[PDB]
Amino acid sequence: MAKVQVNNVVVLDNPSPFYNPFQFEITFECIEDLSEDLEWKIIYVGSAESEEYDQVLDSVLVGPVPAGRHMFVFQADAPNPGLIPDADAVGVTVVLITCTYRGQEFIRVGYYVNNEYTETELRENPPVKPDFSKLQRNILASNPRVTRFHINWEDN
Numbered sequence: 001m002a003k004v005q006v007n008n009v010v011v012l013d014n015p016s017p018f019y020n021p022f023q024f025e026i027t028f029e030c031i032e033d034l035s036e037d038l039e040w041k042i043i044y045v046g047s048a049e050s051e052e053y054d055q056v057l058d059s060v061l062v063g064p065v066p067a068g069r070h071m072f073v074f075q076a077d078a079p080n081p082g083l084i085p086d087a088d089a090v091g092v093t094v095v096l097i098t099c100t101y102r103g104q105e106f107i108r109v110g111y112y113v114n115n116e117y118t119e120t121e122l123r124e125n126p127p128v129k130p131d132f133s134k135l136q137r138n139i140l141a142s143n144p145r146v147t148r149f150h151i152n153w154e155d156n
Contacts, residue, residue: 003032003101003153004065011111012073014139018115018132022057022076022095022139029069032153037063039100042076045093046083053083081132089130091115095139101153110145114138 008027013020022042040060046053058076074097084093097109117123118136 001153002106003034004028004030004038004099004106006099006107006109007069008071009097009109009144011139011141014113014141015136017118018081018135018137019078020137021078022074024074024097025071026074026097027069027071030065030067033067034062034065036102037061038065040074041098041100041105042074043096043098044079045095046079047085048088048091048093049085053085055080055083078132084130084132086128086130089115089132089135090117090126094145101151102155104149104151106149106151106153108147108149110147112140112143112145114140 006026006028010025011023012025013023026040038061041056042058043054043056045051046055057079060072060074092112092114095111095113098105099107115135115137117131117134119134122131122134
């Protein structure tokens, strides 16, 4: 009953300084023809300390999505640096790729990005205020936390 099934998903550009873009290569195969537009989203974890600081950055919508395996590149800029917390900025945050269909999201890709300063010295002594310009984003694409949700693609 699925209209879209993401098969190949990889993270590119990483690892690079935090001011790099969320570059994802999303290959999803549409099993059936979409009449509604597929809303792809990057909901990034704002704080592990308080996950309510989470923020969606960019959303790629394809109205309509024809049946077939499409491979598009998802690109968003860096998350709001004011939402990333002191003690968690120097750590591992998650970048979620949720796909909204009919107001219901059927998949959430949890990519763990490990953020550590590139300056070895700053790795030694993390300052009271993290330095996002020194911070390296190692998006561990080898660890894809795939949470899929069973929803109704058919409007029943």
